[PDB]
Amino acid sequence: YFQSNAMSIEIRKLSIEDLETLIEVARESWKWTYAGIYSEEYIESWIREKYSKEKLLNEIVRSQSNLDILFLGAFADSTLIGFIELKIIANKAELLRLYLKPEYTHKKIGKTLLLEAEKIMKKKGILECRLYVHRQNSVGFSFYYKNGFKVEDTDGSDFIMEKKY
Numbered sequence: 001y002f003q004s005n006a007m008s009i010e011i012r013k014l015s016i017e018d019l020e021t022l023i024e025v026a027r028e029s030w031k032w033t034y035a036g037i038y039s040e041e042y043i044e045s046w047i048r049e050k051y052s053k054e055k056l057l058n059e060i061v062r063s064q065s066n067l068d069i070l071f072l073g074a075f076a077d078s079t080l081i082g083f084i085e086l087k088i089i090a091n092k093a094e095l096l097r098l099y100l101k102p103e104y105t106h107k108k109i110g111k112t113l114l115l116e117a118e119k120i121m122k123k124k125g126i127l128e129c130r131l132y133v134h135r136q137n138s139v140g141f142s143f144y145y146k147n148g149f150k151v152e153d154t155d156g157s158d159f160i161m162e163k164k165y
Contacts, residue, residue, distance in 0.1 A: 004104050006076035011116045014060045014071045014083065019053065021080045022060070022073070026051045029083070029099035036136060059085065070120055074113050076104065084113040086121075086129070093121055095131040098140075107143060114147055118165070127165050132158045 002009065014022060027047045034043060063071035068089060074082035082100035086093050095117075100110055121129070131149060133140050134157055141159065149161040
């Protein structure tokens with residue numbers, strides 16, 4: 001059935017009360033996206049600047065205010081286990097990050113997050129979504145093509161991938 005020791009798995013917008021759990025979960029979304037690339041030293045540092053309380057708060061508020069960010073969390077019985085964050089400029093979107101904790105890495109949850117993210121974007125009118133994926137990240141790359149994105153270019157170390165609606 002699920003193996004995630006929880007009677008419900010759900011997706012909703014992050015609220016300002018999710019802040020501290022989100023910081024922990026964002027900090028790992030990063031050590032995994034780059035565990036095979038940056039040094040221990042550099043990783044421990046870069047998280048400070050990007051996942052500060054103020055920047056994550058800025059992003060949750062902006063998502064909550066229906067402005068330039070969409071920030072959904074995936075929760076197992078009240079526990080945050082993943083998220084997806086997108087920037088919305090005009091009618092385009094950029095998928096900035098998508099993450100599930102290893103213990104809950106079932107492609108149906110990641111797909112649920114991405115799926116609810118598109119339902120919200122249809123209604124807002126976003127017609128196009130881009131994303132960046134490091135070349136070694138084969139799990140992401142695979143997940144992405146299976147859900148509709150194609151390679152548009154390379155940015156040195158990353159595939160720029162795209163999907164129109």
